[PDB]
Amino acid sequence: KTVVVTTILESPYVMMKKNHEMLEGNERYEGYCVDLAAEIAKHCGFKYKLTIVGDGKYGARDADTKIWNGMVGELVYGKADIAIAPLTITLVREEVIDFSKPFMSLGISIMIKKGTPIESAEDLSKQTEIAYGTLDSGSTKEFFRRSKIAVFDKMWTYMRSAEPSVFVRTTAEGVARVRKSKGKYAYLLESTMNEYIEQRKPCDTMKVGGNLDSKGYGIATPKGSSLGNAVNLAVLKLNEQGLLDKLKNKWWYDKGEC
Amino acid sequence: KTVVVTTILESPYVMMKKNHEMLEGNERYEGYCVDLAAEIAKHCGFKYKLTIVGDGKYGARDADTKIWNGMVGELVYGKADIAIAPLTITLVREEVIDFSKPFMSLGISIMIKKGTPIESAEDLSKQTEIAYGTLDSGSTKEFFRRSKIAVFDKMWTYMRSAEPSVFVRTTAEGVARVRKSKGKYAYLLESTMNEYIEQRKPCDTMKVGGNLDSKGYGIATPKGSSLGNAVNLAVLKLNEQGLLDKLKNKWWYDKGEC
Ligand SMILES: Cc1onc(O)c1C[C@H](N)C(=O)O
Ligand SMILES: Cc1onc(O)c1C[C@H](N)C(=O)O
Ligand SMILES: [Zn+2]
Ligand SMILES: [Zn+2]
Ligand SMILES: [Zn+2]
C-alpha cells in the first residue's frame, strides 16, 4: 500500500516547483522535506504520496472540543500515515502521536526588520512600541502560553491580549508583517526558518539574540504504527551518513541569495 | 523495586563529592546527571540507586566477540535498569537499547592548547606535525571509522594507524594530553565537554571550528523496558519547563573558573 504522507507548504522544506503546472504527483514539489521523504521511503522500502495538510497548520488541540488540527490531527484521525515536515517534538504531541529521533535541532528565535532597536526577548518584554507575536496552532505559541520564566511569561501576557492580534496563520504572513511594519513588529519563530529568511531577498530581516530554547523536528507517525520503528532507525542512519547535513546546506546556503 | 542506574564518572555530569567518604549511597555524588537522575525519578515515581559503570566506558560492541561493553553493555545484559549519562544516541546503540528523546544537543568538536595553529578539521587533516585522537569505545571514534566524507576519512586513516596510539581511555586523559603536549596534540570530543573544560583552570584549552556533526544525549533503557515511556515523557516535560537549560548553566558557567 502507498503510504500517505502529510506535509505543509513551508519553504524551504516543501515548495511547489516553478513549473509545477505541467507536473504530477510528488513531482510537483521540491525542498528539504521532499528530499528527506524520498530517502526515508528508499530505506524503509515503501511507495508514497505527498499531500499538503488541509488546514495548513502544524497541530494544536482545541481546548473546548479537545480535537486536534493540522498535521498532528491528520495522523491522530487516520487521514495520513506519516508526517514529514518541520514538526516540533513536544510533550502534548508525543502523548497522541509517535516521533522519530530528531532530524534537525533548533530553537525559538527573534526576527526583526534590519535596524529595529531589539537585541533580545528581554528587550521586547520591556517595551510596547514594537509589537511581536508568533504562529498560531503551533509549538511556539504553546511555549509562551506555558512559560513560567519571568520574561517569557510577561511576553505571553502582552501577546495573549494584544489588539489587533499579533498572531499569524502562516510563517509567510509573519515574515511579510515584519517586512512591511517599518520595524514596529518582531516575529518569534524557529531558528531554522529565521536563518533561511535572513539569506533571502530583499535581505531586510535578521535573527537577533540567542535561541530561547533547544528542541528538534521529528518524523511523526500515528500511535502504534508499523512504520514507526523503521522510520526512526532510518533517520539515525541518514544523520550519521551525513545526508541530513548535506540537505541542510543544499536548501539553506547553496541557495542563499544575500 | 529500586531502579539500578548506571552512569559514568565524567565531570561535570557525575563527580565524587569532596567528602563522599563520609556520605552514603546517592549522596556521595554530584553533578548534572545526578541532579537529572533525581528529577527523572521524582517525575516517574521510582526509587533508584546510582552505580558507576565497571569498565568506565560508554559502550561499543567488540568486533569479534560481539559483546557490548560500558553502560550500553550494562543495559543489554541486565546489570542496570537505566543509564543517565552523556551517552550519545546512535544507530548501532538504538538497535540494542532504547533512548529517550535527547536532553542535550551537541556535536563533535576540536580541543586545542591555546596558540595551536589549527582552526578546523580540514586544518588537522592537511598536516602531520600536530597529532590528534579521540576517546576509546565511543560514538566519536565510530563516527570517524564510518565516515565517508574526504576530510574525516583522511583523519581516520591517520588516527587508526598512528603510533604511539592517539586514542585515550577517558576524557580526562585526552584533556591532560592536550595540556601537556605543548600544542602537538589536539583532542576530538563532544562540544559539551569541550565547552566545559574551556571554563576550567588553568584555562589553557579552547574549542575551535564548528561542530563536525549534530546529535544528542538520551537516557537509555533496556529494549522493551516498562520505564521507557515515562522516562521519555519526563525528559520532554523537563526540557519544556526549562530545567535542562537551568542545569547546564549551573554546572558549566555559574561554576566557571575562567
Ligand atoms: C516551522 C515553524 O517555524 N516557527 C514555528 O513556530 C514553526 C512551527 C513548529 N515547528 C510546530 O511544529 O508547531
Ligand atoms: C562525553 C563524551 O565526550 N566526547 C566523547 O566522545 C564522549 C562519549 C560519547 N558521548 C559516547 O556516548 O560514546
Ligand atoms: Zn540514502
Ligand atoms: Zn474551539
Ligand atoms: Zn521536578
From Swiss-Prot, chains A, B:
Residue numbers carrying Phosphoserine: 147, 181
Describe tissue expression: Detected in forebrain. Detected in dendrites of neuronal cells. Expressed in the pyramidal cell layers of CA1 and CA3 and in the granule cell layer of the dentate gyrus.
Modification after translation: Palmitoylated. Depalmitoylated upon L-glutamate stimulation.
Q: Where in the cell is it found?
A: Cell membrane; Postsynaptic cell membrane; Postsynaptic density membrane
* Binding residues for L-glutamate: 86, 88, 93, 139-140, 190
Site annotation (Crucial to convey clamshell closure to channel opening): which residues? 118
Gene induction: Down-regulated in the pyramidal cell layer of CA1 in the hippocampus by global ischemia.
Return the annotated site residues (Interaction with the cone snail toxin Con-ikot-ikot): 61, 145, 237
Q: Which residues lie on this side of the membrane: Extracellular?
A: 117-258
S-S bridge residues:
203-258
Subunit structure, per the record?
Homotetramer or heterotetramer of pore-forming glutamate receptor subunits. Tetramers may be formed by the dimerization of dimers. May interact with MPP4. Forms a ternary complex with GRIP1 and CSPG4. Interacts with ATAD1 in an ATP-dependent manner. ATAD1-catalyzed ATP hydrolysis disrupts binding to ATAD1 and to GRIP1 and leads to AMPAR complex disassembly. Interacts with GRIP2. Interacts with GRIP1. Interacts with NSF via its C-terminus. Interacts with CACNG2, PICK1 and GRIP2. Interacts with GRIA1 and SYNDIG1. Part of a complex containing GRIA2, NSF and NAPA and/or NAPB.
Question: Know anything about its domains from the record?
Answer: The M4 transmembrane segment mediates tetramerization and is required for cell surface expression.
Q: Which family does it belong to?
A: Belongs to the glutamate-gated ion channel (TC 1.A.10.1) family. GRIA2 subfamily.
Describe the task this protein carries out: Ionotropic glutamate receptor that functions as a ligand-gated cation channel, gated by L-glutamate and glutamatergic agonists such as alpha-amino-3-hydroxy-5-methyl-4-isoxazolepropionic acid (AMPA), quisqualic acid, and kainic acid. L-glutamate acts as an excitatory neurotransmitter at many synapses in the central nervous system and plays an important role in fast excitatory synaptic transmission.
Q: What else is known?
A: The postsynaptic actions of L-glutamate are mediated by a variety of receptors that are named according to their selective agonists. This receptor binds AMPA (quisqualate) > L-glutamate > kainate.
Q: What is this protein called?
A: Glutamate receptor 2
